[PDB]
Amino acid sequence: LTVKYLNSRDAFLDALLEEYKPEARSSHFILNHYLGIAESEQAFVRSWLSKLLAS
Amino acid sequence: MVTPQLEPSSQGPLSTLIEQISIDTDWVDRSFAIYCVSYKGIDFSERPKRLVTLASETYKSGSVYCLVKGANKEACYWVLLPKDSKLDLKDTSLAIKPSSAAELPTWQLARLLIKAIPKVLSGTMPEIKRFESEGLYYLVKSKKLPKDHSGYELTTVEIDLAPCAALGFKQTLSMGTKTFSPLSWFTLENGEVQKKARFATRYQLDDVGKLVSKSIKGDYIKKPLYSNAKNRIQAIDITKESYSGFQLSKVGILEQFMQDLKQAYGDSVSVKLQRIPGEKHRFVSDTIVKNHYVGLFDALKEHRLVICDLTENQDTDAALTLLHGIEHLDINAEIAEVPIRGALNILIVGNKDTYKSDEEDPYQVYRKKYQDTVFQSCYPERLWNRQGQPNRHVVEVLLKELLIKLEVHTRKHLIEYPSGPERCVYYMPQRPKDESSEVRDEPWPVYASKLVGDEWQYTQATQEELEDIELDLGNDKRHVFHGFERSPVIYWPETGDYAIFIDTGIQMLPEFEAVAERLRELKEGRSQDVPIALLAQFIEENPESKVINKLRAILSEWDDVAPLPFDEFSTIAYKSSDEKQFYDWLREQGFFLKTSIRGQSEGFFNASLGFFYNREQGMYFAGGKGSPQSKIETFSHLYLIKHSFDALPEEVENLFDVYHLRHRLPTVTPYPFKHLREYVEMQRFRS
DNA sequence: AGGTGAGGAGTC
DNA sequence: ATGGACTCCTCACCTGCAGGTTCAC
DNA sequence: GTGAACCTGCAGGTGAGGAGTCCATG
Numbered sequence: 001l002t003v004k005y006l007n008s009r010d011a012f013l014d015a016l017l018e019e020y021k022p023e024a025r026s027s028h029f030i031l032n033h034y035l036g037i038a039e040s041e042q043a044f045v046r047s048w049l050s051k052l053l054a055s
Numbered sequence: 056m057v058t059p060q061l062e063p064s065s066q067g068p069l070s071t072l073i074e075q076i077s078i079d080t081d082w083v084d085r086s087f088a089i090y091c092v093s094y095k096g097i098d099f100s101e102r103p104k105r106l107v108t109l110a111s112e113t114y115k116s117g118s119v120y121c122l123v124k125g126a127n128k129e130a131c132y133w134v135l136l137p138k139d140s141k142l143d144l145k146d147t148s149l150a151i152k153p154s155s156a157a158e159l160p161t162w163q164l165a166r167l168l169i170k171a172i173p174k175v176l177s178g179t180m181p182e183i184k185r186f187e188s189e190g191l192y193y194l195v196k197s198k199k200l201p202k203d204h205s206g207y208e209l210t211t212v213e214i215d216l217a218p219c220a221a222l223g224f225k226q227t228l229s230m231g232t233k234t235f236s237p238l239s240w241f242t243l244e245n246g247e248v249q250k251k252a253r254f255a256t257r258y259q260l261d262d263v264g265k266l267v268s269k270s271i272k273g274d275y276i277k278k279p280l281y282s283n284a285k286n287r288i289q290a291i292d293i294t295k296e297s298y299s300g301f302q303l304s305k306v307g308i309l310e311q312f313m314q315d316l317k318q319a320y321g322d323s324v325s326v327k328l329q330r331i332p333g334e335k336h337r338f339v340s341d342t343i344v345k346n347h348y349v350g351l352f353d354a355l356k357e358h359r360l361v362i363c364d365l366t367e368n369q370d371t372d373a374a375l376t377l378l379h380g381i382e383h384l385d386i387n388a389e390i391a392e393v394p395i396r397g398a399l400n401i402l403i404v405g406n407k408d409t410y411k412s413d414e415e416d417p418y419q420v421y422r423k424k425y426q427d428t429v430f431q432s433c434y435p436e437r438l439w440n441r442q443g444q445p446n447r448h449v450v451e452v453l454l455k456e457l458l459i460k461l462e463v464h465t466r467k468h469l470i471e472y473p474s475g476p477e478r479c480v481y482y483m484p485q486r487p488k489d490e491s492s493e494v495r496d497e498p499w500p501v502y503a504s505k506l507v508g509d510e511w512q513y514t515q516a517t518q519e520e521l522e523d524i525e526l527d528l529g530n531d532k533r534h535v536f537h538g539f540e541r542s543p544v545i546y547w548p549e550t551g552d553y554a555i556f557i558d559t560g561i562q563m564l565p566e567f568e569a570v571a572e573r574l575r576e577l578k579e580g581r582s583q584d585v586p587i588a589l590l591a592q593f594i595e596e597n598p599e600s601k602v603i604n605k606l607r608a609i610l611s612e613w614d615d616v617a618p619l620p621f622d623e624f625s626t627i628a629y630k631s632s633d634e635k636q637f638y639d640w641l642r643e644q645g646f647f648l649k650t651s652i653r654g655q656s657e658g659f660f661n662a663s664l665g666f667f668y669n670r671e672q673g674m675y676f677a678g679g680k681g682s683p684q685s686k687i688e689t690f691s692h693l694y695l696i697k698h699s700f701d702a703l704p705e706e707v708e709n710l711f712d713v714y715h716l717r718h719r720l721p722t723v724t725p726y727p728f729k730h731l732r733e734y735v736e737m738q739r740f741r742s
Numbered sequence: 743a744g745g746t747g748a749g750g751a752g753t754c
Numbered sequence: 755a756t757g758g759a760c761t762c763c764t765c766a767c768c769t770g771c772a773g774g775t776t777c778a779c
Numbered sequence: 780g781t782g783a784a785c786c787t788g789c790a791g792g793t794g795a796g797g798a799g800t801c802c803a804t805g
């Protein structure tokens with residue numbers, strides 16, 4: 001049985017968003033425009049998505 | 056007349072005032088076409104409809120990229136068309152005259168090269184009608200509409216040029232927030248468009264450059280959602296040292312604008328900014344303000360303070376809450392059911408509009424009867440914040456204002472103000488409060504204050520004094536005795552000298568190129584995962600260092616082979632002595648993670664702090680205190696002093712050294728101009 | 743009828 | 755169907771702790 | 780010898796942040 005604890009990684013998600021839409025400029029703009037979260041719901045979203053993709 | 060004879064500049068704060076505009080006339084004349092559509096000398100009294108039709112018909116036909124309007128007393132309009140183009144117009148009420156690209160003022164032409172050729176910098180001539188309204192609109196934010204509609208509201212930043220009347224019509228940049236809304240939101244379900252949106256210029260979004268542009272086809276008009284409201288974008292943002300957040304501000308778009316004039320024009324056109332000279336700059340700490348306010352409250356301690364409530368349908372413990380806030384400052388007050396005569400009074404009243412016209416407003420009534428008493432009032436809704444906790448700030452403000460009126464009433468200063476120029480009289484114009492006072496040139500009363508011995512004297516200026524002032528003002532009497540906005544003046548009776556302080560319009564800018572380079576290096580550094588062997592080496596080489604204890608923890612919870620990411624170093628800060636060496640040692644090997652950007656030795660964030668004064672040019676500005684924050688939302692302005700002096704007196708500099716007019720921040724207004732403005736308020740109820 | 747400044751909407 | 759100029763409107767601010775230096779008695 | 784002021788410049792901010800189901804009643 002192997003166990004691992006995962007923390008939050010923002011640089012992990014930053015590059016992935018850029019590769020998803022390579023013709024944009026920044027990362028917050030991609031997250032806000034093409035995906036559907038406003039500025040209030042940004043920290044919490046980053047938090048879970050990083051860990052999910054890392055697993 | 057006086058000309059703005061500035062300096063070529065070497066160092067100092069950076070300004071939004073353009074120093075020089077360079078355009079290669081040969082590259083423009085040989086690549087484009089300029090014409091002239093003259094409507095001078097036809098009829099100056101039949102302008103309205105003919106000018107309307109002039110603009111509309113000139114837009115109707117011709118491959119026109121853009122067109123600007125010339126001076127009201129100058130040649131024609133100005134149009135821009137590509138090479139081998141035609142401005143054929145059937146009507147001959149106006150005459151066309153082709154010209155060159157070296158026969159226009161520089162700013163007019165540069166405006167044309169800023170509008171439409173940057174918007175076409177990918178594709179041009181695909182259809183019949185094309186035009187760009189004004190400026191460039193980059194995109195920073197989108198918001199989803201309510202569930203019953205579709206589309207998004209868009210937020211944009213606008214860049215354009217404008218003149219500056221105060222500095223001899225020199226050119227200034229601008230940056231403004233504008234909002235776009237979908238078309239269907241203003242259209243009724245029966246297909247009847249509302250009156251406002253029936254005739255509205257339409258716009259269209261883009262997916263490549265993120266630029267909103269003009270087009271006949273498009274589902275967007277320039278108007279907010281609900282009604283009169285405001286949307287704003289922050290000035291600068293360096294939160295967590297990220298380069299993505301620095302790209303979404305009003306100084307991040309400005310960096311992109313200079314990178315778009317290069318990739319469409321090369322080096323033919325460039326814009327250079329001006330640095331105001333400066334040698335006297337006084338940073339303000341936090342302890343001095345604190346010690347000032349302590350002595351402020353001590354004087355108020357030795358008096359009587361009463362709180363009263365005069366609401367109709369009494370509710371809420373506003374008196375109790377306010378008294379608690381006051382008593383936390385060692386100032387003891389009381390509660391009364393009716394106001395007392397001869398004591399400082401803070402009254403709680405209701406909304407002014409609610410009470411009927413002939414209803415006897417509690418405030419007005421209890422004022423007019425008691426004519427030797429200081430008064431204050433507040434609404435009961437302002438003592439509670441958004442989350443329900445009491446609001447401290449309001450309490451401090453009310454107490455400070457009470458002291459100011461007490462000082463006016465007793466005619467003798469209580470706290471130690473500095474000294475100012477002597478033998479001078481203070482005059483302030485006052486607008487009539489009658490609703491009929493929409494007359495522009497109608498004479499206003501002017502009130503006068505002065506100091507004799509140790510007592511201030513307050514009186515309404517007589518007619519003779521008013522005749523004396525206007526004679527010596529000269530061309531500057533328009534700012535004192537004319538217009539809808541009249542400014543006060545200090546006058547010298549013996550020599551005939553005046554002082555006027557004028558807001559100009561420039562916003563001070565901090566450094567943005569030097570910050571951006573550092574942020575990009577940090578972003579590149581924070582991408583790789585640091586190998587384990589390097590950390591082991593560091594532990595071996597420096598046994599004494601205290602940081603080791605932290606390191607050993609992290610390595611104990613991680614895989615022994617997998618590299619360590621940046622996020623595992625969050626527990627160690629860049630603050631202590633042994634914590635700086637570790638990060639520098641990693642930097643030498645190619646891992647750059649943390650650095651310092653807000654140090655005062657660096658000097659990047661100095662345009663938004665302290666008090667700045669230049670005596671020989673008479674320029675000054677004020678900003679914040681302490682240390683720069685991550686988020687700043689306002690740009691400081693620039694002011695100019697107009698004088699008739701051979702050399703400006705050295706005593707004026709002391710009138711800006713008071714810390715209780717802007718509530719813990721430096722001010723840009725002399726202190727003697729505040730007391731007098733509180734005497735023109737308790738004189739509207741005397742008779 | 744907290745305050746001073748800095749600044750976005752609606753029309754001759 | 756068009757452009758750029760005054761006047762009135764709304765909105766945000768008003769930090770905080772930790773580590774190295776220094777007198778003041 | 781020491782402990783009170785005194786003097787920079789790096790962090791962190793309202794709370795916490797969703798599905799699935801049994802039965803009687805006009």
Ligand SMILES: [Mg+2]
């Ligand atoms: Mg007042």
